[PDB]
């Protein structure tokens, strides 16, 4: 039961830690329940049962996490469904000249070939649902139509209930604690500053401790880059809600600021790399810049956190100066090494000794990379 | 038409470049066509039409790229479908004590809540299809059963045709040019050596050209790490085909070798980083190690390519020595700088000058990181 105990503890911890999944699950349960309630109070027709099943399936499938995702993916699915329905109805109808079966059969092959071996396109590698639902639609609405004498006046029956299922699903999703995708993004870039600032401090404080907790930080910032633009397409389908004032909110710098920070985060990627290399500076030599490396590490962490705190407020008050102290700290490092830089060189007894400068040099290049980020924030904060 | 012309040119180029998508699309078209052929030669029952639509949908949905993916995801979908069917049938039946409707209605809420807010689990963030199809199954097989007096003897009707659709889909997928997922992996790790070896050579040859093509290489190796283990779960469901001799082929080192190379690829990540930093060594000083940096860059590229070529053959002949020359080349670099290492140091006029050692030091650390990779290959090549 200890494995089950651990699984239950993990579930409880993730539920208490993220009390948004429970809200979403309650919302989807409520949607399914209200649709079932509507179904279970009128059963005069087998077509009513069929349309009921269709409504349940739609409510299941068109319901996902964020508002923008729901709206945009629902619109894409509706476009694909309508297109496939039109195409299949056209081919069914105008496939009846005075051998029409093969002229309907082969059309499946031609349409089937195309979609399956076009969905595999590199650019359209994310809209897998849009093409698949198109292939499912055209196939079903054709076979159902082809088998039946006239599905024209019964196809509208199935479509109308799909709208009711979607109408219920969207209304509860949007009007009951709307988990947007816009403000979720804004909660992500503010997260990136904090979990890299500690990653910076972890690296420096880890380079001097002698005689992964830091891996999660910078890897998250690097590997999340494939995720904001996913939230980007989601966030553009949101109305002017919340503090956000007007239409077309500039969610183009929120990926610029994340991009600029990710550009800076490549050094702290390599900064952790030094403490992992198979060639490292000796202990006797590392603890001679303790006062030097620590101070710039602290100030860099202070600024990066402080800037990340600023985006949380989106400070319409105008900051006075940010990058003064960090510049002085790194400068002192560069002006201090030259006194002891003769402790670098005159195989391996010298490569290890030189492997100290490759850490200090990365740190100074980090500070240099820190200039563009405040430049990106400066423009974003004046047009947001 | 120029935009359409460019789209058509891109499609033609990707089709000719990758003549496997066309095979897959032809296979899916053939599967759909043969199922339609089977349907269109017997229509004595409306249930035949319904089951026909079910068969078409199954053939569409259970059909994907590789053999391992098809088999494993089909098994997972079958498990979920069977579980949901059993659960919903049990609740429908034993939900009839002598107000049974709410006792059926609420069960949807309880099961619905669970799955939707459990599918969101971090660990189970990839099996979205398995949970969703379970929720779709239990919902439909319940509502269809609940509406009908006795769906017990008609539910088996729908299930049997699903098997026929899958049976057709798998047979053509497996027996007509089987695009495995195992050998696809083996074609990926061999790809990683080539596109990093050029990335190495691009970086060094780019550090000296003065008075992205290299970005694609190392980023692919770094960002593919989330993809081999996806192929890993796919590749374990393959029978002993091809040259692969026996059951349970050791596809655990093919991620070790990819892992070991990716560990080495972090330096060439930072190696390209130096040529992008805002602080760089002056031109007058870079072109004094031209003979030094180039030779080790060439030998490192030679070995990394040569090792990657070895995995293509999976050389059962026993190599004599690999890492000799690269070690001598880097050693010469370290033994040559000390003559001119006094050209590093005695703010920015000195940080830029020191920014040369941070390039040579990374390169030597790269060579040091190159030892473990041949160690991983050594064990893999003796048990494969």
Curated annotation (Swiss-Prot), chains A, B:
GO CC aspect terms: plant-type vacuole membrane
Disruption phenotype: No visible phenotype.
Tissue: Expressed in hypocotyls, leaves, roots, flowers, sepals and stamina. In leaves, expressed almost exclusively in mesophyll cells.
Compartments where located: Vacuole membrane
Lineage top rank: taxon: Eukaryota
Membrane topology label: Multi-pass membrane protein
Keyword Transmembrane helix: yes
Keywords: Chloride, Ion channel, Ion transport, Membrane, Transmembrane, Transmembrane helix, Transport, Vacuole
Keyword hit for 4Fe-4S: no
A Gene Ontology BP annotation from the UniProt entry: malate transport
Regulation: Slow activation by external aluminum.
Protein name (record): Aluminum-activated malate transporter 9
Source organism (scientific name): Arabidopsis thaliana (Mouse-ear cress)
Species lineage: Eukaryota, Viridiplantae, Streptophyta, Embryophyta, Tracheophyta
Gene expressing this chain: ALMT9
């Amino acid at each position: 039961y200890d494995d089950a105990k651990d699984v239950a503890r993990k579930a409880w911890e993730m539920g208490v830690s993220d009390p948004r999944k429970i809200v979403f699950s309650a919302k989807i349960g409520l949607a399914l329940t209200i649709v079932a309630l509507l179904i279970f109070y009128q059963e005069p027709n087998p077509d009513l049962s069929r349309y009921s099943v269709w409504a349940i399936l739609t409510v299941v499938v068109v319901f996902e996490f964020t508002i923008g995702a729901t709206l945009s993916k629902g619109f894409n699915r509706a476009l694909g469904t309508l297109s496939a329905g039109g195409l299949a109805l056209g081919m069914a109808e105008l496939s009846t000249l005075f051998w029409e079966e093969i002229f309907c059969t082969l059309s499946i092959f031609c349409i089937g070939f195309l979609a399956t071996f076009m969905k595999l396109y590199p650019s359209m590698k994310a809209y897998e649902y849009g093409f698949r639902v198109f292939l499912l639609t055209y196939c079903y609405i054709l076979i159902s139509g082809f088998r039946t004498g006239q599905f024209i006046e019964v196809a509208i029956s199935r479509f109308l209930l799909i709208a009711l299922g979607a109408g219920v699903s969207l209304g509860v999703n949007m009007f009951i604690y709307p988990i947007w995708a816009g403000e979720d993004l804004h909660n992500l870039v503010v997260k990136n500053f904090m979990n890299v600032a500690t990653s910076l401090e972890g690296c420096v404080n880890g380079y001097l401790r002698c005689l992964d907790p830091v891996y999660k930080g910078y890897r998250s910032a690097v590997e999340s880059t494939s995720q904001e633009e996913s939230l980007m397409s989601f966030a553009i389908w949101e109305p002017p809600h919340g503090p956000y004032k007007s239409f077309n909110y500039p969610w183009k710098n929120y990926v610029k600021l994340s991009g600029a920070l990710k550009h800076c985060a490549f050094t702290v990627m390599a900064l952790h790399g030094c403490i992992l290399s198979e060639i490292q500076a000796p202990e006797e030599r590392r603890q001679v810049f303790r006062q030097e490396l620590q101070r710039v590490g602290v100030e860099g962490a202070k600024l990066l956190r402080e800037l990340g705190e600023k985006v949380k407020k989106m400070e319409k008050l105008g900051p006075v100066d940010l990058l003064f102290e960090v510049h002085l700290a790194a400068e002192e490092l560069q002006h201090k090494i030259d006194k002891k830089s003769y402790l670098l060189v005159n195989t391996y007894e010298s490569a290890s000794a030189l492997s100290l400068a490759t850490f200090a040099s990365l740190l100074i290049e980090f500070v240099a990379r820190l200039q563009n980020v405040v430049d990106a924030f400066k423009e974003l904060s004046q047009k947001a």
